[PDB]
């Protein structure tokens, strides 16, 4: 029986690209940058987060883009 990857793999988890750097903010990596993992966003003191607070590596790419602080 010959199976196929649903994930990426000659007879593992897919990986999302680097999320970038959130200016006047912080990007928290909970686990890794692979498929299924999620990241969290926070802004600095006196900054409002305009956009999503989290983002997941969905089927691969980031579910939500980079938010903004002011």
């Amino acid at each position: 029986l010959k199976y196929t990857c649903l994930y990426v793999r000659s007879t593992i988890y897919k990986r999302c690209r680097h999320p970038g750097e959130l200016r006047n903010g912080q990007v928290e990596i909970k686990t890794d940058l692979s498929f299924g993992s999620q990241i969290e966003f926070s802004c600095s003191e006196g900054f409002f987060l305009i956009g999503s607070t989290t983002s997941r590596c969905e089927v691969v790419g980031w579910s939500h883009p980079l938010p903004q602080c002011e």
């Binding site: 990426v8 793999r9 690209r17 680097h18 940058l33």
Partner: protein, 90 residues
């Protein structure tokens, strides 16, 4: 006392290091994730099978033409020898 300032300075530069070489390898890893898929090999084996079968078909047809050509000349040579014994006038 001044050691704590050196540990945080070393940890900060190390954090900016392991993150930076990750960014470089993450870009190169994307090129390796794409070259994995597969279709180039399935198309290579399928393309060679077509050219190889075109060789087996062109050669068999050429041999079948020569075999049919030999039989044609034999049937004509025997008919010529028959018309010669009939003329051989006594």
């Amino acid at each position: 006392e001044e050691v704590k300032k050196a540990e945080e300075s070393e940890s900060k530069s190390a954090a900016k290091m392991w993150e930076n070489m990750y960014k470089e390898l993450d870009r190169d890893y994307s090129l390796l994730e794409k070259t994995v898929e597969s279709l180039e090999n399935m198309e290579n084996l399928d393309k060679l099978n077509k050219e190889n079968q075109g060789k087996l078909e062109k050669l068999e047809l050429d041999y079948l033409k020569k075999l049919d050509h030999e039989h044609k000349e034999h049937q004509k040579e025997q008919q010529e020898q028959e018309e010669r014994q009939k003329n051989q006038l006594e």
